[PDB]
Amino acid sequence: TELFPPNLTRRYFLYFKPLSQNCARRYRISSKPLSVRQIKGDFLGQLITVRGIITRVSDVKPA
């Protein structure tokens, strides 16, 4: 007897989406478009957005 590990029956994913609207100017940041240059500090293990230019597109492979 072995129960299902929870990863078997999902057939779905999760996603997230931050904010940079006047709700940040309502009352209180985590979604200012910081560049790549100033990012090496305590920003490791967080949620940060960065703008850029996408290069080196690989293909789609099954994991």
Partner 1 sequence: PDAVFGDRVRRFQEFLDTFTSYRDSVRSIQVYNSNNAANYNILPHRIIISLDDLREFDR
Binding residues (CB under 8 A) for partner 1: these are: 24-25, 28-29
CB of 8 to partner 1, least distance (A): 44
Closer to partner 1 at the Cβ: 7 or 22?
A: 22
Looking up tokens 């609207």 gives 21
As a three-state string, the secondary structure of the chain is: CCCCCCCCCCCCCCCCCCCCCCCCCCCCCCCCCCCCCCCCCCCCCCCCCCCCCCCCCCCCCCC
Closer to partner 1 at the Cβ: 26 or 56?
A: 26
CB of 19 to partner 1, least distance (A): 13
CB of 57 to partner 1, least distance (A): 36
